[PDB]
Amino acid sequence: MIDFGNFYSLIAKNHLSHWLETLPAQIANWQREQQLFKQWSNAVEFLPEIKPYRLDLLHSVTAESEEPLSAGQIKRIETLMRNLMPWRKGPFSLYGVNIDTEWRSDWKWDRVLPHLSDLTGRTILDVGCGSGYHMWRMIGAGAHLAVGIDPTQLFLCQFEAVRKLLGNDQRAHLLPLGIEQLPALKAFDTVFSMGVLYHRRSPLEHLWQLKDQLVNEGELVLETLVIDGDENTVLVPGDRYAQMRNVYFIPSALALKNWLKKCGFVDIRIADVSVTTTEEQRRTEWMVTESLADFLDPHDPGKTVEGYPAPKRAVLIARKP
Ligand SMILES: Nc1ncnc2c1ncn2[C@@H]1O[C@H](C[S@+](CC[C@H]([NH3+])C(=O)[O-])CC(=O)[O-])[C@@H](O)[C@H]1O
Numbered sequence: 001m002i003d004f005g006n007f008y009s010l011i012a013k014n015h016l017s018h019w020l021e022t023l024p025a026q027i028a029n030w031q032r033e034q035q036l037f038k039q040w041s042n043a044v045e046f047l048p049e050i051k052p053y054r055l056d057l058l059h060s061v062t063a064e065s066e067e068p069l070s071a072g073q074i075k076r077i078e079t080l081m082r083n084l085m086p087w088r089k090g091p092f093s094l095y096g097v098n099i100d101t102e103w104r105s106d107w108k109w110d111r112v113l114p115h116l117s118d119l120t121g122r123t124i125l126d127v128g129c130g131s132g133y134h135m136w137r138m139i140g141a142g143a144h145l146a147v148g149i150d151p152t153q154l155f156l157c158q159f160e161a162v163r164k165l166l167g168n169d170q171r172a173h174l175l176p177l178g179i180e181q182l183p184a185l186k187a188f189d190t191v192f193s194m195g196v197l198y199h200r201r202s203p204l205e206h207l208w209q210l211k212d213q214l215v216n217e218g219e220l221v222l223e224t225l226v227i228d229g230d231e232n233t234v235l236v237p238g239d240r241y242a243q244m245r246n247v248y249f250i251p252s253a254l255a256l257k258n259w260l261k262k263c264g265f266v267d268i269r270i271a272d273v274s275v276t277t278t279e280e281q282r283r284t285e286w287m288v289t290e291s292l293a294d295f296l297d298p299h300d301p302g303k304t305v306e307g308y309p310a311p312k313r314a315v316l317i318a319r320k321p
Pocket of ligand 1: 089105108127128129130149150151152155177178179180193195196199223
C-alpha cells in the first residue's frame with residue numbers, strides 16, 4: 001500500500017485540520033476495496049529515492065543529478081516508469097527519462113498561468129489532478145501546498161513515482177478521493193477544476209462544491225470542454241463524445257459564465273478558449289492506445305467521429321465573495 005500518514009500529520013498542523021474528521025475513513029475504505037495493481041505498486045516501491053541536485057518546477061518538471069547517472073540506472077528507472085503507462089498528463093523529465101505524455105499539459109498551464117492571482121504562498125486544491133503534473137507547476141509558481149484529488153489507482157501510483165524521484169517532496173499530495181466525497185472545507189486559497197465539469201451529472205452542484213472548498217475571496221479556476229454560442233447554447237451528447245463515455249454538459253463559455261453567476265461566483269472572466277489540436281493530445285511512446293486523431297471525423301477535424309463539434313476548451317476564472 002501507500003501510507004497517508006505524512007499527509008495527515010501535515011494537515012493536523014495547518015488550516016486543513018478539520019479534514020481529519022472524514023479523510024482517513026474515506027481513504028481507509030478506498031484502500032479496502034482495492035484488492036494490474038501489484039505491477040503499479042512495485043513500480044513505485046522499486047524506483048530509487050533520489051534527491052534531485054537540480055529541480056525546475058517553474059518552467060517544466062525537470063530533475064537532474066549533479067553527476068549524470070549510469071546508462072543502466074536510467075534504464076531501470078525508464079522501465080519501471082514504463083510499467084505505469086498510460087502516461088497522459090505531463091510531460092516529466094527525470095534524470096534523463098523523458099516522459100512524453102499524451103497531453104502537453106504544459107500548454108494548458110501556459111494558457112492558465114497569466115490569468116491567475118499570484119500563487120505564491122497559497123494553499124491549493126486541484127480537483128481531478130491526474131498524474132499531478134500541474135501540482136508540481138503550482139509548487140514552481142511558489143504555492144505553499146498543493147493538494148490534489150483523483151480516485152484512480154494508476155494516477156496515485158504515477159504521482160508517487162514522481163514524488164519519490166523528486167526526493168520525496170512533501171509540498172504536494174494526491175488523495176484518491178472523488179470530488180463528491182469532500183465536505184465544505186472552505187479552506188483553499190485557489191481551486192482548480194480542469195477537465196472535470198463535463199464528467200459530472202450535476203454541473204451546477206459541481207460549481208457549488210468547488211465554491212465550498214474556497215475561503216472568502218478565494219479564486220476558482222475552471223477549465224472544461226465547451227461549444228461556440230450565446231448564453232443559451234449547451235450541448236448534451238449521447239453515449240459518446242470524442243469516444244468518451246459519461247460526458248454530460250458542454251456549454252458555451254458564455255453559458256458557463258452565467259452558471260457561475262447562478263452559483264454565486266463573482267468577477268467572472270472568460271480567459272482562454274482554444275480548439276484542442278492533435279499536437280496538444282496524441283499517442284506517444286508513453287501512451288500507446290487511441291487518442292484525439294482517432295476521435296475526430298477523418299474527413300473534417302472540426303467534428304468528432306460521432307458528428308459533434310470538436311473538442312474546444314475554455315478557462316474561466318472567478319472569485320468567491
Ligand atoms: N469523481 C471525481 N472527482 C475528481 N476527479 C475525478 C472524478 N472522477 C474522475 N475524475 C478525474 O478527472 C480527471 C479528468 S482529466 C483532466 C486532468 C487535469 N485536471 C487536466 O486538466 O489535464 C481528462 C481531460 O479533460 O483531459 C481524470 O484524471 C479523472 O480520473
